Amino acid sequence: SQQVDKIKASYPLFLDQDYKDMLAKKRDGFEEKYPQDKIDEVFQWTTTKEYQELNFQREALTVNPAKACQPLGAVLCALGFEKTMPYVHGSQGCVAYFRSYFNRHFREPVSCVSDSMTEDAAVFGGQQNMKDGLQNCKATYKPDMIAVSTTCMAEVIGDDLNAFINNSKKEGFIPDEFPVPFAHTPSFVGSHVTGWDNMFEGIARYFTLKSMDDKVVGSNKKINIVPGFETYLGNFRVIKRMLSEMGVGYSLLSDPEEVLDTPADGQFRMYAGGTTQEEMKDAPNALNTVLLQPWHLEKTKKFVEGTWKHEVPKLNIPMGLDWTDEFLMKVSEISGQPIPASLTKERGRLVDMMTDSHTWLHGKRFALWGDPDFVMGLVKFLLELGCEPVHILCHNGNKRWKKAVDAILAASPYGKNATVYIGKDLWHLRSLVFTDKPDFMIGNSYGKFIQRDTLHKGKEFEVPLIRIGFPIFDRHHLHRSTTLGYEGAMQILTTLVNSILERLDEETRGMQATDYNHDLVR
Amino acid sequence: SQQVDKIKASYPLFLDQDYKDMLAKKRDGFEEKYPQDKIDEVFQWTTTKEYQELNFQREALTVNPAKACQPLGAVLCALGFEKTMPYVHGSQGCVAYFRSYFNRHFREPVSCVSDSMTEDAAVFGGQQNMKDGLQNCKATYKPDMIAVSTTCMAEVIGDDLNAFINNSKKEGFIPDEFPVPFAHTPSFVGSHVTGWDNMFEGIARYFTLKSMDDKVVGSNKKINIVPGFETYLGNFRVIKRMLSEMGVGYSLLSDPEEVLDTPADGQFRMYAGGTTQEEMKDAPNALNTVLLQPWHLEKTKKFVEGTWKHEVPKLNIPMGLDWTDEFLMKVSEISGQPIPASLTKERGRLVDMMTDSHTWLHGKRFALWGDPDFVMGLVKFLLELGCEPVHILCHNGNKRWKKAVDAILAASPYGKNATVYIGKDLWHLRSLVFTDKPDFMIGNSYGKFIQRDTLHKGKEFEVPLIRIGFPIFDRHHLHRSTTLGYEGAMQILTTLVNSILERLDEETRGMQATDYNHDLVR
Amino acid sequence: ILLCHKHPVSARLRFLIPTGGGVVLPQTLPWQLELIGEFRLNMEVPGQIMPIYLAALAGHELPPPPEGTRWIELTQSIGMPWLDRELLRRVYEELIG
Amino acid sequence: NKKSQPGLMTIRGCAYAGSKGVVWGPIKDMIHISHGPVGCGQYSRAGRRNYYIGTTGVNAFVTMNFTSDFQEKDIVFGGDKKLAKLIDEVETLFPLNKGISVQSECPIGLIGDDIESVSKVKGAELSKTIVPVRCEGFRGVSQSLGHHIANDAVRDWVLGKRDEDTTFASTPYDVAIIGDYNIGGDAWSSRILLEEMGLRCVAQWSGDGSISEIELTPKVKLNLVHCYRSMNYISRHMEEKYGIPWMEYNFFGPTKTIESLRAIAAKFDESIQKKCEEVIAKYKPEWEAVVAKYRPRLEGKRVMLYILRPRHVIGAYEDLGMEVVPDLIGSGIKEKFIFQKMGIPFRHSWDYSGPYHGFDGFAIFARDMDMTLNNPCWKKLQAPWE
Amino acid sequence: NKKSQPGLMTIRGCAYAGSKGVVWGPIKDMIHISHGPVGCGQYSRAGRRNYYIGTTGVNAFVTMNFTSDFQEKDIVFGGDKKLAKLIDEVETLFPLNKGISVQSECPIGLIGDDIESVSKVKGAELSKTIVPVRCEGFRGVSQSLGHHIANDAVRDWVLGKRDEDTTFASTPYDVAIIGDYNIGGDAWSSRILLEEMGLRCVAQWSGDGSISEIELTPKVKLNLVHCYRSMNYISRHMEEKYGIPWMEYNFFGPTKTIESLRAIAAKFDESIQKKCEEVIAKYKPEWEAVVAKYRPRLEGKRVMLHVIGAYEDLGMEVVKPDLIGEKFIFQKMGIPFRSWDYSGPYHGFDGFAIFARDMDMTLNNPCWKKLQAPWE
Ligand SMILES: C[C@H](CCC(=O)NCCC[N+](C)(C)CC(O)CS(=O)(=O)O)[C@H]1CC[C@H]2[C@@H]3[C@H](O)C[C@@H]4C[C@H](O)CC[C@]4(C)[C@H]3C[C@H](O)[C@]12C
Ligand code: ICS
Ligand code: ICS
Ligand code: CLF
Ligand code: CLF
Ligand SMILES: [Fe+3]
Ligand SMILES: [Fe+3]
């Protein structure tokens, strides 16, 4: 039943008595459900430490992973170039899932095509698929460039991207001069950040490898900036703004913030902004190349140091205070530009906010997860705030990254109770937060379910989720936030302290029970 | 009892059994408290429509007001000028309260002095207090200018500010050429915004009244911007940024964002930035003067139009979409500068965000309160979003402002269930949100108690608070937010939609009860 | 003699004045009491120069006023003639100021 | 049902999406392993709003993501041993699961993996129903072949489990809801109407579906199929094997809902018809009030739809006086923001709203259509200075 | 205790802040009208953290702001009729209030308003205790005169309300906590120790204070004063009138807490002394563990400032100070700074743990070590 004055959506319409009775009848008569006491007992068991021992003994089963596959990152990297079409040679379902994922995170159109590889392609190969797809894509969407990645199907059957594209150009399906960079992105190796790295390395090799004879390091007096897999448009914006404030000539390669923030003015823009092909061709002439996320840009670093002859600085992600300082100092040293007074004032204002909120931030326990560089930057900033990152999870991390994060934690008194987990999923983290309860957990939207689980054990066991990372699906416009630089640290600090304050306000809203601490001033 | 491993603050230390027993013994033995069922009955009565009728018949009692007194606004206006000391001629307790209030809102040092008028001043006046205070303030803090307001003491005893300052200059307590603008700010007239208006008019008169012979309108090809009582530094910043993007020369009179955001670098800065005396003296030479918050800048508008001969445009507060558009068009018309493509792109991005969030925002019921211009701008933006304002409360509003807001509501189909209240306090709003429950409240920190009260009636009756306005005491760094322009509209939209989504997530977090609607993608 | 009590903690200055008129003691102007040496004031009455000194009542508790006398504050002097108001102001400035 | 042109932004999904995402995933008490690399399981995790009641992680697992997480060694050497070890770990960590399905991703059918033998061996060892689904994404041209493969798996592994069991107490009013995936509670809104008609909904899958309901489906008297495209295979098989007639029911909009209710009641005796008339009379004022409120705001508007068989959603749009051919367009999330960029009001996922089926869902549908079509945001696309 | 120099930045409050903010406001079951313009009541609303137990708006009104909201007409023609109508409306809308105080702001005493007569008339008519407080802010040099005026109002209108009432059953272990305003729950942390000692805290005001507790205060055997500066007037008055001895107790730091507990127990018989010894023995391991955890990370640090003992118990010198006990100015200078801001309790053994943790948190926070930009 519905009242037209107040129409109820699914919640709380299905809380109505008739719906409750119908659901109870269904469950009791035909679902053959386990008894509620047995369900409660099993849940309590899953919250225990012995269940954690069983869970961490997993070798073949992955439950709720915290990573994606390479071609998603390859598509994201391809989206950062001017009038460039991401083209995933392989099955269509992969591209549909990539587009849906990025649409849900960014709430923007995401352009990506597939050559619709099918059983016939599984038998004889996707060469005809590649030719037809490249021709159709160029004719229909008129891109300046087509960046080709692969699905697991094409990698497993062993399609040669180079030979396929060469045959497509040779037989006249696409012009010989049309830029078609490619990258092999096996979804069974690494993660989405690895795919981003592979796509960027392939594009750089396509545009620079054969024309290094006339390239001189430092000719254009610019600094190449490779952001890596980044899903915060504010990160690109803050990097560009800080480098413009410094007066530093820069080339931001794979800049997708324009195409992911197109205005609504009655016209659909298929492409917007992006790194130009001239910028990629002139990249070796830069003074140096700075990798914003070096821990998933290893192949890019190898190519840039080995081919462009760029002495890539050993820089952490510019996240927090110390690492933003080191990034700014390295940029100043490379470019010869002093750090302007505006950036010094912004750093001082970030320090002022840290001083303002240290009373509420100090000693707070956090379980966090995400990509390696983002996770280590968040851990560094939390240590700078006096917080305790007790559970550090990175499903796509490696042993070297774990060693680096352990070294970072050992350098801080607030990392004593911190453990770094690599190759673990969010079920492992659910066990960790049940057995060693943190105050909060920082991660993507997939953490919300964990919070639900904790709330099922009790309100006192609930671990609230702070949504920083990728992907964020249950909130709107968080992709516009910033996590890099002093501005990103400021936003992160505000989010953390305000989350602590909402949690305290909720815990003290009980009248005549806990409202004695429901302070107006905090 | 405290465990050194897990130390408990007041919450939840006083929830311990021993503390509960001690509090129960204290209540039962000596407090002579009313019975618990009896308190419950009285509370339920206070939530009723009969109690609302009894509440709205109040004529002499004000409970939980939503306004401050004039000298606070005068101090805020004075802080916006370069090397200017706010000086409240009157009693010291007023200055102490003003400083504490602004310190708690901004989490920054706030400079303000008093002449410590006491019983001797109550009997003889504060002329000697004025002389000594001006001399000591100039000697101790070395301000370029001392901006003088009044407490209710000096207004009641009829202290002549002009005569007192002139006698102080005559007798050598301060130099004759030292700028000492003054304004009478009776705390029993209007509110803090009235004090801001009075202080700004006094400063402008002091700097321009006697030198209008050599002033020609449009000589400096700039536009004067008067922000009014503004406690969001982001609003000053966004106004300046939008004017710079348009290429429009501007003079932001009373700009306190620098002194209210001093960086922490081991050095304390009493003064920072602010409108210079040259800018005030050259203000009549501007093309026009634009009042950001016209509904509390009546005296400023009268002085600007009657002395500077500026044709002040009929502009609303640049809040939301339509009014920001109108402000930009008026600035373009006055200055001759076209609106650049960057501002058009920002407007389109705001429209895109509105389109993305309209499904969650449409039909939501809001009870809001604050200053008149801020309240009307928020109402206009909510009508633009398809939301339904139901209780529009402005304690310091007047009949003309209420008529304007009613005209705005009548122009939109989403204002049919909207009622505007002027002269009503937050107890009236508590009655309103009990009897006619909205989805959310939008207001300062003082609304949190109202939320608590609603939660005491039941979880289904709880009205969550959204902290937009002044003062915000229980959150950190919200004063850095923006409410003006497209940027402020995006920030407000994000806050509203994410508050809605957070409330929905909280309501659907119950496992096997309501978590069928705990959607990952929202 | 001008009689007053200043509290050692709150610095509340109460003046012991005749209940009829004026503030001077023991006569209309034409306990452990300690004299304030730094305070001196002279009034030119016809044919005589008259000095008036300040006596401070020591302790924490205000004693009840004798007959015909009252304890008043500076604010309570509103409406009283200017001369003794100024005398009270001088005492207040010396003691409180 | 032809091959889509390569490189033309095809909107169709894969066989895995049509099998795991659509048919098998909503089954709450079963655990569904996305066999292969991590991407397919990650992108499909909780993507569809197939609503269910249960304790997630204990007895329900719909929004969970179980995957074998194939690495390079699993591609090179196969993943059958890994599949067996994963099944053992699933049993040891989720003991209350009432069945396991293994949905194959693309590499499974290419590296010559034999998941059927592993499924049989582990099911015999654990006395558990393990359903191998060869829903490799490269198979077929869309999710239709995924639906077909998932239906064949249901028929071959779950449907006939209770063929020799006659202990179920059957009534003449036994119906099974097939093909309703409970998007935002659509199946619940249909089931409340069906049960208020005096019918007993014995089975309801996939949406809010249990494996026991799939096994009990051959015991029903009528099969009410919501989505013909995805479950026509199983409906036809059930008709030719158990002699169970199947009919398509449309509960989208009051007119189609009333017509379908009368058509369903016409398959039973007079008491069911009387209860159908009673239900229609009871719900007439509610949808009449919804129409009176929202039709004036929506009369004359034009709609184009590209999402299923046509005329399914046309009835509800006509019930609001909305001409169907634009003031509104209904498609997926991938085209949603594109048509938003064109500035045309836009409404698969039901835009995180619902239910839209039945009388209760009609109110939500009308409110959502009015909200999207009449939102002021669509009137602010043009900058007033342009 | 002299007038502050005019034109200087000082943190001194007014008599209204001393009376309404400190002494009268924490009384939970009473309604306090800030008589005058809106500002004084608005800025003082919930400013101090005088913790209390009660249903706000029904039977407790500490965090609420009742004001006359004086307009120009009220200034010109007086606000006595407005005060009477306001009292009637207060009784109408808040029936469960156990008393009304009228705290005067600056204009009330300057326009010749007689709130004493209005209070007497309305209290006689409504059978309610209405306490007029002549706490005009211009009176006095600081909040000390506010404390004095509020204490005088307590004595004149509330304290003697049960002078002839002998229906209260008294025990030899009757004590009243005076001058503790329960900042973050300090008074509760003191009261738990006092009642563990075998004493019966009959009265505890202002913090978490009821008007009945004030009326019962003259019936106790000992008056334990926390803040001598604000309540010495009422303490001496009770000593001279009811013959009740008063002593200052200091529960700040384990050493001072132990000394104060023993001093209080010395006033009573041997059983109270034995209970005090049991309390000290029970709480010894907890504060010893707190010291063992926090003193090594706080030893030798200099503090620039009753509260000495807790700092010494953490091994901190008191006087380049590492901490200063004007908060934001010292914050800008870069020296850690510590009514308690947003934490507490700090008194008692339970409060000592919070005090030590907060001192370690503020003094050793990395934010103080990041002031200097690495390139400057
Ligand atoms: C008793 C319960 C099973 C009950 C059952 O068999 N229900 C079958 C459902 C069917 N019925 C009976 C409830 C309905 C009917 O069929 C009615 S009828 O017969 O058709 O008339 C068994 C099965 C799974 C077991 C838990 C898990 O191992 C994890 C864990 C391991 C630890 O070491 C010890 C604790 C834990 C929690 C175990 C406890 C307990 O040991 C559980 C709940
Ligand atoms: S199954 Fe099909 S795409 Fe028939 S794959 Fe798809 S829950 Fe659509 S038009 Mo998403 S043939 Fe169902 C469908 Fe229709 S997932 Fe749902 S809405 S009625
Ligand atoms: S009342 Fe006094 S100034 Fe005794 S006016 Fe002041 S909450 Fe201080 S040293 Mo603020 S005599 Fe209390 C005080 Fe002490 S406001 Fe608090 S900290 S213990
Ligand atoms: S058509 Fe379908 S969704 Fe595509 S792979 Fe094939 S079953 Fe799966 Fe999977 S991990 Fe990523 S998303 Fe692919 S490239 Fe492979
Ligand atoms: S010293 Fe004290 S706080 Fe000051 S006024 Fe006087 S009682 Fe009050 Fe009040 S409304 Fe504003 S803050 Fe004043 S100017 Fe008057
Ligand atoms: Fe968008
Ligand atoms: Fe600050």
Residue numbers in the entry:
A (entry chain B), B (entry chain D): 2 to 523
C (entry chain E): 5 to 34, 66 to 132
D (entry chain A): 49 to 355, 358 to 375, 418 to 439, 442 to 480
E (entry chain C): 49 to 353, 362 to 375, 417 to 422, 427 to 439, 443 to 480
Paper lines:
Biological nitrogen fixation, performed by the enzyme nitrogenase, supplies nearly 50% of the bioavailable nitrogen pool on Earth, yet the structural nature of the enzyme intermediates involved in this cycle remains ambiguous. The MoFe-protein is a heterotetramer with the homologous α- and β-subunits forming an α2β2 dimer of αβ dimers. This cluster transfers electrons into the active site [7Fe:1Mo:9S:C]-R-homocitrate FeMo-cofactor positioned within the α-subunit.
The structure of the MoFe-protein purified from HCA-deficient cells (MoFe∆nifV) revealed an endogenous binding interaction with the protein nitrogenase associated factor T (NafT), of unknown function. Alkaline turnover reactions were performed for 4 h with and without NafT present, and subsequently subjected to concentration and S.E.C. before structural analysis. However, within the MoFe-protein of the MoFeAlkaline-inactivated-NafT structure, the residue α-Arg277 displays an altered conformation relative to the resting state and is positioned between the cofactor and NafT, blocking direct contact between NafT and the metallocluster. It is possible that NafT is indirectly stabilizing the FeMo-cofactor within the HCA-deficient active site through interactions at the interface between the α- and β- subunits, potentially precluding Fe-protein binding and thus preventing further turnover of a ‘damaged’ protein. We further demonstrate that the nitrogenase associated factor T protein can recognize and bind an alkaline inactivated MoFe-protein in vitro.
